[PDB]
Swiss-Prot record, chain A:
Species this chain originates from: Saccharomyces cerevisiae (strain ATCC 204508 / S288c)
Presence of the UniProt keyword Manganese in the record: no
Family the entry assigns: Belongs to the RNase PH family.
Record text on subunit structure and interactions: Component of the RNA exosome complex. Specifically part of the catalytically inactive RNA exosome core complex (Exo-9) which may associate with the catalytic subunits RRP6 and DIS3 in cytoplasmic- and nuclear-specific RNA exosome complex forms. Exo-9 is formed by a hexameric base ring of RNase PH domain-containing subunits and a cap ring consisting of CSL4, RRP4 and RRP40.
Any one Gene Ontology BP term: RNA processing
GO annotations of cellular component type: cytoplasmic exosome (RNase complex); exosome (RNase complex); nuclear exosome (RNase complex); nucleolus; nucleus
Protein's UniProt keywords contain Transcription regulation: no
Keywords, comma-separated and alphabetical: Cytoplasm, Exosome, Nucleus, RNA-binding, rRNA processing
Protein name: Exosome complex component RRP42
GO MF annotation list: mRNA 3'-UTR AU-rich region binding
Subcellular location: Cytoplasm; Nucleus, Nucleolus
UniProtKB/Swiss-Prot annotation, chain G:
Subunit structure: Component of the RNA exosome complex. Specifically part of the catalytically inactive RNA exosome core complex (Exo-9) which may associate with the catalytic subunits RRP6 and DIS3 in cytoplasmic- and nuclear-specific RNA exosome complex forms. Exo-9 is formed by a hexameric base ring of RNase PH domain-containing subunits and a cap ring consisting of CSL4, RRP4 and RRP40. Interacts with NIP7 and NOP8. Interacts strongly with RRP46.
Domain of life: Eukaryota
Name of this chain's protein: Exosome complex component RRP43
Compartment annotation: Cytoplasm; Nucleus, Nucleolus
Coiled coil stretches, renumbered: none
Family in the record: Belongs to the RNase PH family.
UniProt function note: Non-catalytic component of the RNA exosome complex which has 3'->5' exoribonuclease activity and participates in a multitude of cellular RNA processing and degradation events. In the nucleus, the RNA exosome complex is involved in proper maturation of stable RNA species such as rRNA, snRNA and snoRNA, in the elimination of RNA processing by-products and non-coding 'pervasive' transcripts, such as antisense RNA species and cryptic unstable transcripts (CUTs), and of mRNAs with processing defects, thereby limiting or excluding their export to the cytoplasm.
Portion of the full sequence shown: 8 to 148 of 394
Modified residues (Phosphoserine): 19
Other notes: Present with 3180 molecules/cell in log phase SD medium.
Cystine pairings recorded for this chain: none
Organism: Saccharomyces cerevisiae (strain ATCC 204508 / S288c) (Baker's yeast)
From Swiss-Prot, chain H:
InterPro entries on file: ExoRNase_PH_dom1, ExoRNase_PH_dom2, ExoRNase_PH_dom2_sf, PNPase/RNase_PH_dom_sf, Ribosomal_Su5_D2-typ_SF, RNase_PH
GO cellular component annotations of the record: cytoplasmic exosome (RNase complex); exosome (RNase complex); nuclear exosome (RNase complex); nucleolus; nucleus
Signal peptide start and end residues: none
Organism in which the protein naturally occurs: Saccharomyces cerevisiae (strain ATCC 204508 / S288c)
Localization in the cell: Cytoplasm; Nucleus, Nucleolus
Residue ranges crossing the lipid bilayer per the database entry: none
PANTHER family named in the record: EXOSOME COMPLEX COMPONENT, EXOSOME COMPLEX COMPONENT RRP46
Subunit annotation: Component of the RNA exosome complex. Specifically part of the catalytically inactive RNA exosome core complex (Exo-9) which may associate with the catalytic subunits RRP6 and DIS3 in cytoplasmic- and nuclear-specific RNA exosome complex forms. Exo-9 is formed by a hexameric base ring of RNase PH domain-containing subunits and a cap ring consisting of CSL4, RRP4 and RRP40.
Miscellaneous field: Present with 10800 molecules/cell in log phase SD medium.
Gene: RRP46
Protein name according to UniProt: Exosome complex component RRP46
Gene Ontology molecular function: RNA binding
Pfam annotation, one family: RNase_PH
Family: Belongs to the RNase PH family.
Swiss-Prot record, chain I:
Intracellular or extracellular location(s): Cytoplasm; Nucleus, Nucleolus
Residues of the full protein shown: 124 to 244 of 246
Protein name in UniProt: Exosome complex component SKI6
Coiled-coil region(s): none
Miscellaneous comment in the UniProt entry for this protein: Present with 5150 molecules/cell in log phase SD medium.
Top-level taxon: Eukaryota
Primary role: Non-catalytic component of the RNA exosome complex which has 3'->5' exoribonuclease activity and participates in a multitude of cellular RNA processing and degradation events. In the nucleus, the RNA exosome complex is involved in proper maturation of stable RNA species such as rRNA, snRNA and snoRNA, in the elimination of RNA processing by-products and non-coding 'pervasive' transcripts, such as antisense RNA species and cryptic unstable transcripts (CUTs), and of mRNAs with processing defects, thereby limiting or excluding their export to the cytoplasm.
Subunit structure: Component of the RNA exosome complex. Specifically part of the catalytically inactive RNA exosome core complex (Exo-9) which may associate with the catalytic subunits RRP6 and DIS3 in cytoplasmic- and nuclear-specific RNA exosome complex forms. Exo-9 is formed by a hexameric base ring of RNase PH domain-containing subunits and a cap ring consisting of CSL4, RRP4 and RRP40.
Record-stated family: Belongs to the RNase PH family.
Amino acid sequence: MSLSVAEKSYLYDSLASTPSIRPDGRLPHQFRPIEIFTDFLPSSNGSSRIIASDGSECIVSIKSKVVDHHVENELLQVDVDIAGQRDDALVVETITSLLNKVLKSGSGVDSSKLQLTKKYSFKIFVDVLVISS
Amino acid sequence: MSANNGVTGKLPNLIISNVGYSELRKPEGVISGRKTFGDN
Amino acid sequence: MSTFIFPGDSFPVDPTTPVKLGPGIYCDPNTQEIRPVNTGVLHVSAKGKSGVQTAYIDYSSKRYIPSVNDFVIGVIIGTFSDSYKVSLQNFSSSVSLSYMAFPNASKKNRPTLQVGDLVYARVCTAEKELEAEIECFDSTTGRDAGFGILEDGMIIDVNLNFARQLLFNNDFPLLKVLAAHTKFEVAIGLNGKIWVKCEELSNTLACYRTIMECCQKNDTAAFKDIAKRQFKEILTV
Amino acid sequence: PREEHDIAYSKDGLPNKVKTEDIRIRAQNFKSALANLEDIIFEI
Amino acid sequence: YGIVELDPECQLQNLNTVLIADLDTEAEETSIHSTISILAAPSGNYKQLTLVGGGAKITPEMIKRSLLLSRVRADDLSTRFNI
Amino acid sequence: PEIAYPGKLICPQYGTENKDGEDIIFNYVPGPGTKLIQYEHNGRTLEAITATLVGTVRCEEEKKTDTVKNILVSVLPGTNDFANNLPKEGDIVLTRVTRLSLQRANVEILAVEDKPATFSVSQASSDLGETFRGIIRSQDVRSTDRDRVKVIECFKPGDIVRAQVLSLGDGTNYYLTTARNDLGVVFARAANGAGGLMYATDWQMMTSPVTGATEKRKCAKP
Amino acid sequence: ETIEIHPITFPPEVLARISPELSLQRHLSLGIRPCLRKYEEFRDVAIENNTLSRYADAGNIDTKNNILGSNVLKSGKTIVITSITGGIIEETEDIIANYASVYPVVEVERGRVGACTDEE
Amino acid sequence: MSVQAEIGILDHVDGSSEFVSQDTKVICSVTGPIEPKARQELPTQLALEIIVRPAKGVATTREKVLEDKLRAVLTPLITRHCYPRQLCQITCQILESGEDEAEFSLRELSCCINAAFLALVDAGIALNSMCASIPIAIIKDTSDIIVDPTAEQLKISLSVHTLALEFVNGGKVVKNVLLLDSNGDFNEDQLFSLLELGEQKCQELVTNIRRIIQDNISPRLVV
Amino acid sequence: IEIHVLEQDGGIMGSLINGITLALIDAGISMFDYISGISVGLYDTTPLLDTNSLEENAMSTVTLGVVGKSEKLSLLLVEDKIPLDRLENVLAIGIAGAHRVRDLMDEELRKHAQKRVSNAS
Amino acid sequence: SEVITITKRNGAFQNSSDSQIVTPGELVTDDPIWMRGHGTYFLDNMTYSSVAGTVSRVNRLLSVIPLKGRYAPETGDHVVGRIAEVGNKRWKVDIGGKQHAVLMLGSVNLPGGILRRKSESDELQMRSFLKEGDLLNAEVQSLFQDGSASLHTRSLKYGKLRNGMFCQVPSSLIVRAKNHTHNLPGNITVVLGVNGYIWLRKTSQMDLARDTSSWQIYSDENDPSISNNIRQAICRY
Amino acid sequence: QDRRRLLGPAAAKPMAFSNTESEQELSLHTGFIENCNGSALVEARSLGHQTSLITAVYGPRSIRGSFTSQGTISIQLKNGLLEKYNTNELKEVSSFLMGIFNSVVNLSRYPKSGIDIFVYLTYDKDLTNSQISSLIPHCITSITLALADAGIELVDMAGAGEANGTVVSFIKNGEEIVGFWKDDGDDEDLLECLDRCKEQYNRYRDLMISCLMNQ
Amino acid sequence: KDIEISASESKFILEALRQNYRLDGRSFDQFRDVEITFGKEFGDVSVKMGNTKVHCRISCQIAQPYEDRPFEGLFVISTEISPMAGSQFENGNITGEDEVLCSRIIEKSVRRSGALDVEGLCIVAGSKCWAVRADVHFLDCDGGFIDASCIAVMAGLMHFKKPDITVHGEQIIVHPVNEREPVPLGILHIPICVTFSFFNPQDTEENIKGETNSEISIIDATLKEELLRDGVLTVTLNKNREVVQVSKAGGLPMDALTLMKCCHEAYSIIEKITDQILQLLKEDSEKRNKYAAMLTSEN
């Protein structure tokens, strides 16, 4: 966005109130209303569809694959697409590289539940398409 | 032309430089470029 | 058997002569020497011309180099205000033409031409290094409205030396045999452009196909039957 | 951050390292004859 | 290597055709147009030579001079770091 | 306060002397190399003049004529820098001509002078297209006969002009002028490098010695 | 008319940025180089070899390194570092067909972002 | 001298030439002066951009240097001040190898210069002089020197050489050297001998050429 | 015009065009007409309206970009190998499909179009 | 007493006065007497709609009003512009419509008024009075040949905004009336643009002047005295 | 493959091998690159791990885009010789880099002017028999020294200290934090994670100012 | 890089079609005459149709096959435009649209169609196969490139021969060229493409709701002809009367009944030209063998 300077003071004024004030005036800990849909891409292992209040829009797909869990280290892969942008851009790649760290295989991920055999397991694909933000 | 002044009237070598090919034909631009061809 | 030349030959004429430079020769800005820098045949201007002679090389080209007092044919490509965008040859640099350089010169009166028109105009002012300029109406017209916008017609591209012979030369046999069939118009552009309009498109195609073929064959003596045959090729019907 | 050096060879061709002090005096020679001799140019 | 030719105008008191080697310094790399680059192994050997002559002429002797300057600058470096 | 690293906290906003029994207040005024930074320490706030750069402290003053005392704080380098001396409005900048339009003239910024000569050339490489470029519009060449302007009769590509900043303009280029009898063309070679060196015949004209050839340039007053 | 046309002269650092060529011609007048050298004064050359190969320490060659024989080069105002790796393909007097070479990749960090420059 | 050439054999292009020496067929094309791009202009001189297509494969690094040395040679041939803020794209096509592209690039470098020289004559641009290039090799085993070798002789060649010269005064005076591409093993002593035939031969080449140009173009010229 | 291919079922080309014809009307951009698209396949002699990707890899298929109610074409694309003699008949197939396409687009927009003003007003 | 609305619906992509409603490609009629305007194209009789919209028959004029589209600019309208760009002596500024409006250099209220007359140094200060993204009151003057129109501020009442907050809506729901500035209890003021752009701010004295200094027309300042009881009352509206 | 480079014949493969509180330390150097206007050299060596990297400055470069009020920073992380960190792994750090200097640089001193930052992860030993997270704070130090060398208006010698997979960047002699980075570690070890970072920051900034003020 | 033509010239040709004339001298549905000439190398040919000139080259070498089809050899066609052939073009734009419009055709015309047996490139399965290469060069454009490159590639395949092979595990014996002969290649079918060129003399609506079909279609647009055309269509067929590809990718709207009526006329055209290739391949190889008769009797 490109906003105007006279707002930017007032916006920085009102939110830095000591009885702090949002522009929509929520309580300081609130979030905004959303919508959450899933289970709608029946070719997939799982699907997802989420709706923001400003009309920001994404869908994340789940496809799986069986793999040898010894020849491969990363058992869980995230891959992200933002509409309107190049692959090469910054905000793409950082958010992309982030959720890999967020879903490291034994950090908050319980890869034993992913484990198929003593030799095999499940490669998963967190595949992300953001319409708009 | 009357409209302007009628109010006033009633009251180490010898180098000569480059030239275009326009000057290399001798009548020097009286050659009408736009010719229709008349009746025959 | 002609005073044929190469860039890098010995220049023939003595240095102590008052000589108007023609094209094709270049004087050194660094060492003041003067040399032929193009290919072809010199033609020495003969003596008696006020004691001042002139050299010029016949060189062959198709890519037209904009130079002054030269009649060319142009295409309206943009309405940069006060001053037209006009082109003379595809892939070349565009030319600038005043909106006021026109035979009824009137600055409150803005003329009427639109993007994509064909106009007849003469190069007025053009440095080698600057955005070149043309004029339809000129001071060297001497208040002559002889250039101008064209109507529909048809335009054909040739090489430049041919187009000189269309302008500079009466021995050029082309205009004879063409007048010997039908009556029509002709505009000559030193940018290798030849604009023709006839009474008929039928004869214009007959006008078209000859000029493509003749300038290709480039054999002016042969152009008698070659021209007349295309009429029969139109009069095939 | 090795300071650079320059070398030379004599007619033998044996390596002759450049004195650092010379080129400063060269530069002060270079600054000198520049700004002073370029003041007035008396010409035809 | 670089060979240049000289203006009479450009002098400041404290033809003429000078050989320079060990070329650097953008102003040099702009303005030198006849140039020489040589490969050589120290016993008089030559892997390659590279002439782009775009400024001056080239004498037969600036050749030999650069050749004389070739076998020095190489052979020192062969012996400089003794690897 | 003599020598400074960036971040060297120097002095407060205000200071006090007693010059002979009557009380005199200092006003430390932030300049280049400075920034007032508030500092709470153990409860109480404190603004301070901060060294933001590398080199030397310099405290000065001057009052405008055309018991408190203003003191300008000024921070310098000291024993090659041009981001120090970025062009501001009104400056005199030596430039090289890039391209000649019928509209206008385009140059690139190379060297900025200074006030009471002292310069600052840019240390940039133009062959990247790196440097800041500016635009001289053709009616802004001079004010005398500012309408019927013939642009080719004052400039050619690659030439050196003592020109004055008009303003910032866009981010892409600059608004620039030469419209004085002391400003304009500094130096060029003949036929744009194709010949020797050329000298301003008048303030209003330019020739070349060895050639015997002249050209029209809007030369500077020498 | 014989005229003492006074020129305008500058600091030398002004001049080279303006004229690469004439500032050179100033140095040629004294017969020097704008790198402050005389005609044949040549730059020093300084190396260190084998520092970045894993085979630096003959005593304890480390584990995860993959570099065969390394070279540092500084001469003048340009530092260049040469690195050697190797690969293996399954293979199945003085004439050229006896003779092979390596596969190098140069990068010049000349400030410009973007693709592979044509100088490289 | 089994060389032969064609002038003016393309249509929509300013300068065109087919150069055919003994085994290699190469055509060059010249378009200029035309509208330059933004990133390409020079305020003073003429900007040049050169494309060489190989016969085989695509444009890679092996092509790139043969381009770039050919950039160096043309730059003094062109009266570059005559066309400020302009562009002439010149393009060369390798059609026939006549030499092992995996092992050599020698003849093509001789060929393309000899190709592009003539399409400029078709183009009729302000130039400076006359030129020629030949390939020269020295045999490994025989230790002799052949002007214009063949590729099998290249296999037994010890050192491969390309000489480009600048020819004036009826193309007779060596005005300057343009390119000397010394490759392979060589000494001092061979080199002045290595010039000394190509001192003659390139002039002997141009001696043929001076005729050929006028023969092709004086009927294209008018009387 | 932004495309997001989510689930793919074969017939992929004419699938797109029918989505396009919505989207231009979805803002109400100025236009002439409906434009319909459909892949129709050929098992040996027999036309197949509305093939799938299983059938697509099984036989020869043709997609038709059909304009409005007409018999004029926007898109015509054939990858597979086709005997000539069927093709006039093959082309004669898809029009009735294509006319039923822009059929079903229309009312489906219209019942939406009624839903506006009846509850707008 | 919550943070977020999280309500769930899984297993689905989605949850799933009479007048003529016509489609593109559709015939209206072929009575030749009708006139053919917007939303209409034709072939000599065949009246053909081009959008999803309604038949409007005006007395002999038939035209199609769509239902969906961007804001249509019309003259004399009171809207809000966000500053897109700066031109030669021009500015670009979003309407929300198809294109930007334009805004002449002297089209604006000068500080000090008309006693400040023209100056060429003013184009050296375009960025002084205006810069990007800023919001203001603008008065729709007139158009171009396409349908792109321009603006101005011919009052004190028009000018650059402050003292509040922006919001935006679809252009449809804003109803037309003879008035557009409105003052609401809570000491505050809505500035309803027509185009769908909505600015709130605190009621000024000039606002109070409507119903009973001048050098601050490019300021980024507000009234410093802004209570939260102002500020929280903003959010409720 | 790639028609722009020399990558050998395709069927080759590189060579393969198999198995058959501590001190950190610096060596900081400036003024050694003549292309730039700001250069900085960093040696690092710590206990199994030796690291060297180069930070390069180009500024102020012109912006062909449009007007801005102030300056703009551009940061590149590039692999050197041996260690190959992942591509998306790089730019995340580049994102984390820019946030801190946007509380450092007087961009308001530099309208319509660009900042180019080239960081060359040149060579690293890890002889130890979140691998990028161990190299974060040294970058900021390496940038700051080069940015002092171009002499650009910087508020503070800001630095980051490390405590075991955790990176915290300071100002004001540690009295405020400007950049926070955390990986796995413990839980609520933050208070000790204040300390060991702070004292390295207290070490490092003194090492930095020695590198310049003594020159 | 933009071609500029007057709208006056635009109406001119559009009038000529309205009186059934075209500037070249052909009929509407008449094709240019084709000059095919081979170089000395195998897979070397120069192909020329009046003004348009092309040149292509076939080669082959040893590589391994993919994992994808581990049975079969490798083959691909390069069609990199050089701005030599006209100043419109970028230096090797593989991302221009018209390039792709040249590309995907020849991709489908050869590769997905399979005129060439790729399985007959299998020297040894999975170990060593052939990598066959087709570099297309343009020389000078008057259009018909995608028809010219259709021909000149398929011309080149019927003139290339590959050398002799002997297998022993890894001991893969490529023989000398001149002792053991080079061996030509296996062509399943010969495809020939046809450009069709389309001209509305009217507005849009008389094409759209003007029921009267009134649209002129010609063969082999010349350069000036090509710059004003309204739709673009290419079909490809064989001798066995099967249709290889069709591509009308948009442009002008167009009746179906025209297209069949168009494509039948393609058939009689392409067949005669096809056999003209077939004799010249023989006749040159006859001239090769008669000069081989003029060689062994000579030697």
